[PDB]
């Protein structure tokens, strides 16, 4: 855009701000212009950046596969095509913007991963309790991570459990002690 000489790039939306008659631009705490008054029609417009929203790509090893799942944090799924301006985008990024493997997590909308009802250990942590993995015809699945085996203790006020055997276990603990000494 170019508004009265102020050039830039962004998405233009209608604004609620009211400028005093001697004012033409409005600025943020970061001092960037976020509101403008249209010269031909004196209507306030808001200027919003176009890139927005965090994007993560979930991949198994490229050695294993070239499937990917894309996580759009801070967009619900209904608004994925609007938030990333899916129409400007290439056809591939469009199949990803809509597809059919659209799953709504609390971390954001996850597209390209199949949601399963099972629970496993975490393989690729996605967030908000969701993990992803490459599982079997192979595909990327997204699931709620398992905290562990559900268990119960047979407690009563006069029952005790005494071990009658034992194991001698030997476990390894690795600790770094030093790092490389460098000089410049």
């Amino acid at each position: 855009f170019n508004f009265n000489g102020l050039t830039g790039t962004g998405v233009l939306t209608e604004s609620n701000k009211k400028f005093l008659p001697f004012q033409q631009f409005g600025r943020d705490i970061a001092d960037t212009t976020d509101a403008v008054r249209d010269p031909q029609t004196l209507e306030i417009l808001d200027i919003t950046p176009c890139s927005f929203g965090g994007v993560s790509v979930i991949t198994p090893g490229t050695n294993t596969s070239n499937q990917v799942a894309v996580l759009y944090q801070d967009v619900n799924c209904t608004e994925v095509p609007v938030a990333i301006h899916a129409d400007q985008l290439t056809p591939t990024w469009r199949v990803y913007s809509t597809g059919s493997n659209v799953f709504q997590t609390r971390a954001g909308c996850l597209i390209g991963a199949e949601h399963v009802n099972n629970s496993y250990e975490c393989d690729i942590p996605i967030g908000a309790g969701i993990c992803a993995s490459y599982q079997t015809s192979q595909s990327i699945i997204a699931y709620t991570m398992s905290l562990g085996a559900e268990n119960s203790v047979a407690y009563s006020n006069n029952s005790i459990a005494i071990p009658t055997n034992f194991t001698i276990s030997v476990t390894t603990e690795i600790l770094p002690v030093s790092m490389t000494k460098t000089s410049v």
């Binding site: 962004g10 001092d31 609390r106 562990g148 268990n151």
Partner: protein, 343 residues
């Protein structure tokens, strides 16, 4: 997002930053390290036991009342009464971690601080374990320590009546178990009143959870300072890239843009450095919480003043926002009487 923070949709700035691209790959590498480290901290503190023990159906602990500290099903979350007082005390910057574009759309963007952060590429990622999962872990630790004593930490959980476990622990501090069996009723009533006093003190004072609130405030302030430093000129004719690119040609423009690039890159470098130092202090605190979880929830500690002032009997973990609260039950000697002695 470096390009978005430093350049904010300007192709000319992006082409200029391609000179300083290694620094942004480095910054994002450091931030990703900090993030996976936060998740590992929560793992190391709460996921010690991988069996999820369920609370016993009938509560018969010998007059000890754990209703306040044990999960209640009526609430949708499996959280204790105390855990809820704790989650109500610490006020976070924003809840949900999903602020939609349609929500930041409009003049709400300028008004809201989180929208201003998101429009400049500063994102807050959600933690891997939700608060419900952390509450399930803490409930598993309570049900294991209540029903099995310390045995569930060493191997398979072996049930034992709670009064017998308290007699064990009384042995652990040098008091013969007959003392507890003869004062079972008093001890239980003293415990219960102590828990009630904990609950009352939490429900009254608002600044009890000072450390967790301080962590939250410091992170929010760091992000807000990072956003404010976009108004700095750094020696350029303006602090807005669009003004410079509107007024000057590309040869007269690149001197100013390179000044803005150096200054904004130094702002991000200072932010990441102070986050690495804060993450090292949080990691030291999470290693301490993992040691108090292993050594004083999953056992009885003989270390003096490690778990409470007095002779440590047992501890109970409660999950707090971004933290953990230990309820250390100790035995404090009282009503001293003078006597004459001999070797």
């Amino acid at each position: 997002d470096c390009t978005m923070y430093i350049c904010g949709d300007s192709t000319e700035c992006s082409n200029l930053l391609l000179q300083y691209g290694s620094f942004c790959t480095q910054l994002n590498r450091a931030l990703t390290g900090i993030a996976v480290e936060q998740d590992k901290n929560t793992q190391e503190v709460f996921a010690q036991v991988k069996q999820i023990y369920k609370t016993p159906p009938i509560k018969d602990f010998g007059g000890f009342n754990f209703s306040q500290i044990l999960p209640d099903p009526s609430k949708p979350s499996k959280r204790s009464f105390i855990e809820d007082l704790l989650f109500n005390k610490v006020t976070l910057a924003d809840a949900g971690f999903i602020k939609q574009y349609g929500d930041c759309l409009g003049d709400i963007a300028a008004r809201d601080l989180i929208c201003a952060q998101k429009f400049n590429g500063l994102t807050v990622l959600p933690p891997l374990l939700t608060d419900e999962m952390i509450a399930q872990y803490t409930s598993a630790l309570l049900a294991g320590t209540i029903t099995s004593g310390w045995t569930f930490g060493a191997g398979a959980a072996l049930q034992i009546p709670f009064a017998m476990q308290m007699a064990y622990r009384f042995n652990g501090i040098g008091v013969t178990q007959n003392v507890l069996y003869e004062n079972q009723k008093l001890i239980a009533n003293q415990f219960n009143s102590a828990i009630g006093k904990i609950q009352d003190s939490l429900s009254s004072t608002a600044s009890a959870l000072g450390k967790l609130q301080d962590v939250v405030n410091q992170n929010a302030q760091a992000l807000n300072t990072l956003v404010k430093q976009l108004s700095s000129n750094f020696g350029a004719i303006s602090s807005v890239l669009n003004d410079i690119l509107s007024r000057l040609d590309k040869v007269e423009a690149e001197v100013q843009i390179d000044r803005l690039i150096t200054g904004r890159l130094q702002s991000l470098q200072t932010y990441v450095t102070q986050q690495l130092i804060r993450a090292a202090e949080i990691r030291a605190s999470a290693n301490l919480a993992a040691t108090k979880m292993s050594e004083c929830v999953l056992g009885q500690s003989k270390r003096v003043d490690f778990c409470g002032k007095g002779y440590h009997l047992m501890s109970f973990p409660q999950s707090a926002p971004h933290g953990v609260v230990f309820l250390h039950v100790t035995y404090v000697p009282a009503q001293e009487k003078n006597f004459t002695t001999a070797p």
